């Protein structure tokens, strides 16, 4: 019926962490290789690279992530990177346009623009469908941030070693979320469940992304357009 | 292996 | 006293090759990460990467380069890349500004701009000094192109296997140059020699570059700003 | 080793 002092300080450091790693003006977007309408690939690879940096910045501020071994910090960031990106992107996604609108007509990413980056419209439909659903949940900033931290700390991942310590951290976070909705969110009686279902949805979006990325990464003429960080984070190296 | 990730995480 | 039909067709395919890989309007420069005044590093790494692509395109059209093994084609491109870049850059270098002027006030690279890309003004002075000298030679397009092809086909290089076949190719090119100056260049009686001296000069500029690049390449926060192609071409891998 | 250089040279 009331969130504890420690559940509150977890919400605090997490929203502050998101505030320091997410710019609603999208100012830095001008430093990327320009969008061209695979003409969109250099801009979108620059965008994904910049976002991996922010996901890293955010992750480092999740209570307990820092305590983990360098190895587990990497295993989790590698596997969840694309999922955190897709979640955080919702903050820019509009239902009125069915696009990710980032402060400008040049940083407005519609389905057709993502197609000119190697990808197939058939594999783009589950992403926009996932983005419509997420937006329809009309999440509070605390819930959104909590969903990214729970997603990042997921145990079911290739390379993770301390599957007991991160399951512990994810549960302490799931606990903060479940209590937050009940206390602070009216009409949210079935929200916790609706959100956990989005984590599973993301796992499927992740597979489909990994397959599409594999296609690009093997063609050196496309791989060369990527950044060292994207190559490293999405690469198979152990 | 993962030289950038390591630097960024420190 | 007269260039042979075969010395002429070597000049032809070489100037045509340079025409297809060098854009005097510098239009593609807008597709790079923007210049910022190490703020210049993303733009300059994008510039060097784009130029490696053009040097590759050019190399492929040098008569006889294509016949070489894939290995030697690589050994030569890796070692000479920076030198071909420095030579080809002269076409944009101005004596009136002491800068590389590329169709725009944003693509005007002065000494101070190159400093904000990791490099030290002390190691920049031999480059501009090399650029003043090269420009003072007032080379014909045929001589300039011939100098890049001779530079690329240099035998004294790490990794080269067929040191007899490329020395042969470089000499057949040196022959075309020496005859061209005598027949087609008035007051060039000491030009061939002045130019060969620039190849040696470049070798010193290359060492100094390799040392400076090593400094950047080891710091992952700087290396991440480079491109896959720059990393590959300037990397130690064999 | 040198996957891009190889692709570009062909
Ligand atoms: C960045 C966020 C926002 C936008 C994000 C959106 C819109 C543009 C397209 C993005 C970046 C998607 C693509 C596309 C995917 C696709 C399917 C088939 C679903 O798998 C992911 C990628 C990639 C790459 O394959 C590589 F290599 F991996 F990089 C690339 F194609 F090569 F690039 C996912 C999230 C999307 C902007 C703003 O909200 C910031 C936020 O962080
Ligand atoms: C491109 C050409 C022209 C310009 C070229 C000029 C002016 C800008 C600065 C350049 C690109 C120089 C730098 C600087 C060097 C220096 C000393 C100390 C001399 O070693 C080379 C580099 C590099 C990098 O270390 C890496 F990693 F290797 F990339 C980077 F700093 F990281 F980027 C050499 C040629 C210069 C433009 C036009 O003529 C086209 C032409 O092809």
Question: Nearest CA to A140 among A197, A196, A184?
Answer: A184
Q: Is A88 marked as binding a ligand?
A: yes
Burial label for C117, CB within 10 Å (0-12, 13-18, 19+), is buried
Burial label for A105, CB within 10 Å (0-12, 13-18, 19+), is exposed
Distance between CA atoms of A26 and A104, rounded to whole angstroms? 9
Ligand 2 centroid, distance to A229 Cα (angstroms): 23
Radius of gyration of chain C (CA): 18
With left for phi above 0 and alpha for psi between -120 and 50, is residue C62 left, alpha or beta?
beta
Angle (deg, nearest 10), helices C121-136 and C70-89: 80
| Phi and psi torsions of C153, nearest 5° | -85, 20
Strands of A108-109's sheet, edge to edge? A93-94, A99-101, A108-109
Mutate to test the pocket of ligand 1, among A35, A45, A48, A50 (most ligand atoms within 8 A of CB): A48
How would you classify the pairing of strands C99-101 and C93-94? Answer: antiparallel
PDB experimental method: X-ray
Is-contact C228 A224, C-beta < 8 A? yes
Rounded to 5°, angle at Cα A38 from A37 and A44: 75
Sign of CA dihedral A91, A97, A102, A107: positive
Q: What is the DSSP string of C105-167?
A: SSSEE-HHHHHTTT--HHHHHHHHHHHHHHHHT---HHHHHHHHHHHHT-SS-TT-S-TTHHH
Distances (CA, A) of A57 to A52, A53, A61, C56, C211: 9, 6, 7, 38, 32
* D5:C60 CB<8 A: no
Is-contact A128 A98, C-beta < 8 A? yes
Q: Is C231 on the interface with A (CB under 8 A)?
A: yes
- Distance from D8 to chain A by nearest Cα, in Å? 8
Q: Is C220 on the interface with B (CB under 8 A)?
A: yes
How would you classify the pairing of strands C93-94 and C108-109? Answer: unpaired
Atom 26 of ligand 1, nearest CA residue: A45
3-class DSSP string for A14-76? HHHHHHHHCCCCCHHHHHCCCCCCCCCHHHHHHHHHHHHHHHHHHHCCCCCCCCCCHHHHHHH
Q: C14 by DSSP, 3-state: which?
A: helix
Q: In the beta sheet, which residues pair with residue C101?
A: C108
Is-contact A213 A179, C-beta < 8 A? no
Question: Nearest CA to C181 among C151, C142, C148?
Answer: C142
Distance between CA atoms of C97 and A155, rounded to whole angstroms? 60
Atom 40 of ligand 1, nearest CA residue: A89
With left for phi above 0 and alpha for psi between -120 and 50, is residue B2 left, alpha or beta?
left
Distance between CA atoms of B10 and A127, rounded to whole angstroms? 32
Distance between CA atoms of A69 and A72, rounded to whole angstroms? 5
Is-contact C196 C14, C-beta < 8 A? no
- Distance from D7 to chain C by nearest Cα, in Å? 10
Distances (CA, A) of A204 to A127, A152, A207, B5: 10, 16, 5, 25
Q: Is A119 marked as binding a ligand?
A: yes
Instruction: Please indicate whether residue C43, judged by its CB atom, sits closer than 6 Å to ligand 2.
Output: no
Q: Is A231 on the interface with B (CB under 8 A)?
A: no
Å resolution of this model? 2.5
Atom index in ligand 2 nearest the CA of residue C114 equals: 9
Fold of C1-238: Retinoid X Receptor (1.10.565)
Question: Nearest CA to A106 among A19, A18, A22, A47?
Answer: A47
| Phi and psi torsions of A99, nearest 5° | -140, 165
CA C142 to chain CA centroid, Å, is 15
With left for phi above 0 and alpha for psi between -120 and 50, is residue C30 left, alpha or beta?
alpha
Where do the structural domains in chain A lie, given as residue ranges? 1-238
- For testing contact with chain D, the best of C61, C69, C71, C73 (most D CBs within 10 A): C73
């Amino acid at each position: 019926h009331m969130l504890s002092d420690e559940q509150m300080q977890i919400i605090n450091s997490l929203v502050e962490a998101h505030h320091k790693t997410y710019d609603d003006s999208y100012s830095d977007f001008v430093r990327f290789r320009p969008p061209v309408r695979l003409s969109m690939l250099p801009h979108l690879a620059d965008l994904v690279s910049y976002s991996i940096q922010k996901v890293i910045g955010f992750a480092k501020m999740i209570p307990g992530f820092r305590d983990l071994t360098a190895e587990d910090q990497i295993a989790l960031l590698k596997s969840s990177a694309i999922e955190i990106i897709m979640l955080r992107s919702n903050q820019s996604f509009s239902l009125e346009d069915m696009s990710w609108s980032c402060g400008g007509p040049d940083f407005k990413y519609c389905i057709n623009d993502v197609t000119k980056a190697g990808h197939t419209l058939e594999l783009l439909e589950p992403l926009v469908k996932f983005q419509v659903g997420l937006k329809k949940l009309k999440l509070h900033e605390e819930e959104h941030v909590l969903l990214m931290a729970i997603c990042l700390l997921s145990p079911d991942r290739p390379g993770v070693q301390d599957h007991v310590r991160i399951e512990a951290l994810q549960d302490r976070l799931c606990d903060v979320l479940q209590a937050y909705i009940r206390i602070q969110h009216p009409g949210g009686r079935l929200l916790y469940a609706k959100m956990i279902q989005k984590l599973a949805d993301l796992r499927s979006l992740n597979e489909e992304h990994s397959k599409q990325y594999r296609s690009l990464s093997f063609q050196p003429e496309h791989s060369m357009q990527l950044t060292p960080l994207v190559l490293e984070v999405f690469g198979s190296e152990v | 292996k993962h030289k950038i990730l390591h630097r960024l995480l420190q």
